[PDB]
Every structure is written in C-alpha cells, then in structure tokens.
Hints:
Elements: E1 9-14, E2 20-24, E3 30-34, E4 37-46, E5 49-57, E6 67-74, E7 82-87, E8 97-106, E9 109-117, E10 133-146, E11 151-157, E12 161-162, E13 170-171, E14 174-181, E15 184-185, E16 187-188, E17 194-202, E18 207-214, E19 222-223, E20 232-240, E21 243-250, E22 257-260, E23 268-269, E24 293-298, E25 301-309, E26 321-326, E27 331-336, E28 347-352, E29 355-364, E30 367-374, H1 376-397, E31 417-426, E32 429-432, E33 439-442, E34 444-447, E35 450-453, E36 459-463, E37 480-488, E38 495-503, E39 510-517, E40 522-525, E41 543-550, E42 553-558, E43 561-562, E44 568-569, E45 579-585, E46 598-606, H2 612-620
Parallel strand pairs: 8-15
Antiparallel strand pairs: 1-30, 2-3, 4-5, 5-6, 6-7, 8-9, 9-10, 10-11, 10-12, 13-14, 14-17, 16-17, 17-18, 18-19, 20-21, 21-22, 22-23, 24-25, 25-26, 26-27, 28-29, 29-30, 31-32, 31-46, 32-33, 33-36, 34-35, 35-46, 36-45, 37-41, 37-46, 38-39, 38-45, 39-40, 41-42, 42-43, 42-44
Amino acid sequence: AASLAPGSSRVELFKRKNSTVPFEESNGTIRERVVHSFRIPTIVNVDGVMVAIADARYETSFDNSFIETAVKYSVDDGATWNTQIAIKNSRASSVSRVMDATVIVKGNKLYILVGSFNKTRNSWTQHRDGSDWEPLLVVGEVTKSAANGKTTATISWGKPVSLKPLFPAEFDGILTKEFVGGVGAAIVASNGNLVYPVQIADMGGRVFTKIMYSEDDGNTWKFAEGRSKFGCSEPAVLEWEGKLIINNRVDGNRRLVYESSDMGKTWVEALGTLSHVWTNSPTSNQQDCQSSFVAVTIEGKRVMLFTHPLNLKGRWMRDRLHLWMTDNQRIFDVGQISIGDENSGYSSVLYKDDKLYSLHEINTNDVYSLVFVRLIGELQLMKSVVRTWKEEDNHLASICTPVVPAGCGAAVPTAGLVGFLSHSANGSVWEDVYRCVDANVANAERVPNGLKFNGVGGGAVWPVARQGQTRRYQFANYRFTLVATVTIDELPKGTSPLLGAGLEGPGDAKLLGLSYDKNRQWRPLYGAAPASPTGSWELHKKYHVVLTMADRQGSVYVDGQPLAGSGNTVVRGATLPDISHFYIGGPRSKGAPTDSRVTVTNVVLYNRRLNSSEIRTLFLSQDMIGTD
C-alpha cells in the first residue's frame, strides 16, 4: 500500500513539546520536564517487555544541544508505558549530550552504546580531535514480577562505562578520532557474541564502518579487521546464514552492503544480492538516512526487514517511510508505513509474539515526535508473500527431474532464484510468480505458461535500472542467469531479438543476448562484438535458452549446449555495467518497428551463474516447471 495500511494504526508515543521525562537535577531532585523533540528511536523486546529507547532533545532538535537518553517500557504490548531517563549527560555545558543509541538485547539485559559529548557546538567529524567525546556503554536489567493477575516490570540502569581506552589510535594507518555505534538495534550472533556495527571518524574528517564485538558479554571488546569504504556511516547489522550483513548509510550515493563470514575480519561487498539496491532519494545525490535492518522468522521462513524513507522531498525531509522484506534473493516492497506525504526519518521495526510494530520519527517544522505503529495490514501482506515464496520453492524442489545417464535427477535449482514469469499475465503485465518485479508487456496473447508476441514492439520488459530509485535487480550487473523456453513462430526479415539484457545509455547497446535470423541461424550477442550467425534452428520447434553472465563474461546456451562465442568478455573495465532491463521478444516504444514473432514461456532469473549441471537440469525439466 501507498500509505500506512488499512487495519493498521499508530499513537504518538513520544510526543514533541508535550511528553515529559523524569529529569534529575544536579541536587538529586527529580522534575517532570517537557521535551522539545524525541529522535533516534529503537524498540526492542526484552523478556516480553517492550523497551523503546530515544534521544530526549530537551530544548531543540539540533544535534549540538542538551540531550539525554529516554526510555519508555511496557509489559502489556503498548497499553501502558513507564518512562525513564536511562542515561544522563555530563552536565558540563548547555550542549552536553548523550545520543545516537545503539542497542543489543541478550537475555534480560540491554546493552546501550551512545556517543557522549561535553561542550562542542560543531559536529563530530569536524572536531579538531576526540577530546570532547566518549563512547559510553550502559547495561540495563529488566526484572519482571506480578501482582494478582497483573505483571509488572522495572528496569535498573547501570552507570556508564567509557570504551575510549579500548579504541585503537590507528587502523591500518588510518588515525582515529571518534566512534559511535551504528544506531538502532544491533545483535547477539548465533555464537553468543555481542556485535555492534560502529561508525568511525578519522583525524582527517572521513567516516567508515567496522564491527566491534564481545565474546564475554561486554567485559571486553574487539574491533574486527575489516572495514567499509570511506563515506559509509550509521551501519546496521544482522546475521544471515552464518554471516554478518552490514547495511550502510551513504550520504550522496547508493547504499553499500557488505557480508563477512568471519565476525568482521574480512568484508566483501554484497554485489550479488543487496549492495546498491537502496538509496537516499530518486536521484541518489541527497543526504541519506538511518535504516533499521533486522532478521525475523515469518511463517517459519527467515527473512530480513529493512526500513527507509523514499525522501522524494530531499535533504533531511525523509518523507515516505517504506518497509521492505527480503530473503536475500527476492526483495518485496511491503509498502509505505508513514502516512501520506509527512516527513518521517529514523525508524525501528519489531516482530514480537506474532505482531509487527514500528517506532519511527515524524517531523513538522523540525520538531520531532516518535510514533508507535501497529503494522497489522503490513504483517498480513508479509505472511501472504512468505507463503508464496515457500510454496513455489517447495513445489519446484519437489519436481522429479529426469535421471541422466551416469528415482530422480538433480532438483530444479531454487537457490538464487529471484524471479519467474509463467502462466499468470493480465493486461499489460506479466506477473512475477514471486510477487516482486513484474514485466511490462505489449502486443501479446496468452499461451500456457507465457506469451505469444505479434505486433510492433511485441514483447516484455523486465526492468533492471528501469525500476528507478530502488534497484532490486542490481545484482544483474555483477552476475545473472536468465532462462526461457521459446518458439520462433515466423521468419524475420533480417535479424530480430529474442532474449537479452539491454544497457542504459546512448544507442541500443546490449550486454548479452540472443537474436535469430532469416537464414534460421542463431545470433548471440556478446557485448559490443558483431553478432555473427551460428548453428541452425527450425520454425515452431521448442528451444531452451539460457544466458549466463559472470566475471565480466557471457555465454548463451541453446538446449543445454553453449553457442559458439560463449565465454567471451562482455564488459570492459572495472566499472559495473548498468543494465536497463531484460527484454523478452522484441519490446520497444521507439526506434525500429521490431516485430519478433516468437512465443516465450517460463522465464526464470537467478542472481548467480548456474553451473552446467544446473543448466542441464533446467533443460530437462522445462515441461515440468510451469504454473499452469
């Protein structure tokens, strides 16, 4: 949905210029003090108690102001809340502040890491040195009790401990200045380690990210060897299939995502999955925003949830907060969870006892509140989609494929299966069986499991860069396998397109593709190289086509066998290509009046280079995989 879903609702939990916090005066007295703005939200579940953490920006929303860490907690899923100040600031000046909380829950304990500042009026990267700063760790302990019928809870907050003495003065030559947690909910790894993603500012103004972890429940901390590129900030981390996935804020460019299989020692950019998928605005040259990135299990399937504003207004406005759900293959836009065109901002998502919630900023005139949202309609859609993913994957994996001369052969490949176009098509849309990215169609007629094209521009466009702001098929620029079953229905006049990856930019360049000609020969396209004819085909005969691209190389298979020219380099340079779309048939809205008279069924897209055995399996099982 394009706004907070039907059935969903929210309350202004931390209300700007209204909600009070128990401020402790220097002389120990406590007064209920009104707070100008509440920012930087995190909501977690500690032993059944919801705990919401935020910056209480007492006097103004600006970073360089008087700020303390506030907490609201609830034992009844939001019916009632108790309010606290979990971390006080130093009280050294009118701008003393503890801020930008990053939180880890383990058992009944909360570990909160904040940046503490005494007197600076400028931002952390602009500081001459790190003398005004300390990274503070605070541990809270949640205790549950219960009167007659009603459970109660209290949270005891420990005194802050500075981790400054544990901060190396240099990293591989880079001289350090300060570090802050990545903001939001961090994790306990499957091995029990406390894992904080951190953002580090070096002496020379640059920011980059690293992993800071503890194997002893917070007694000691280690900074892992790996790091992001410079320009990455507010990293969020989760664990996926034994690896850490670090999703970074990147002001002024697309969001970089990295994977590490060794607790942060080595990082590799997630080129084949999530890196550069998300961005800061339609044009990618705007201030970015913090995002929550959390792993949950829905309908028995593990998935990752990611929240980020579309920021159509630009700069710090951050309108239109969206929620996305991914299984590291498919990426689904659950929809907009903020309301209308309101400015949102930082956000947090929590899945607790089969209920989904968010705590996020709303901003009018730079006065900020935090809304606590019950994502009812969203969870319903999410469950529906997870069931689709499970059911289709299970169905394909259960097919008994033919045994090859050496009960069943190898399973139909589902690992890395991103999209699938099959029987369902309606109007000008060919539906993704996986419900994420449909293809747009023209001059088509439905046939079992696909479409027959007849007319100018007859064909389908499966958008890649054409997806626009959020590029869910960004992996294709690094590697892909595109599969389809085809028949050529009428001879072309000269040459005509059948299947391929088009590139953005001047001309009508293709990265890798297959065309066919009037002499009944194949015309594979391998990048800029001249499309030299090869082999022989027959009208009306069913052919299995596979395009593979990896390591800057491309191959075209017909009926499980590579065509001449396969393995040739298709992209030159170290710069990723920019695929506009995959084309099926001969779609066009301009240029030559292409009219490819072909029928294409069961188009499958993978985010990896399928091996020859997997290709053979698909070839042998092509009559078994359709949706009907």
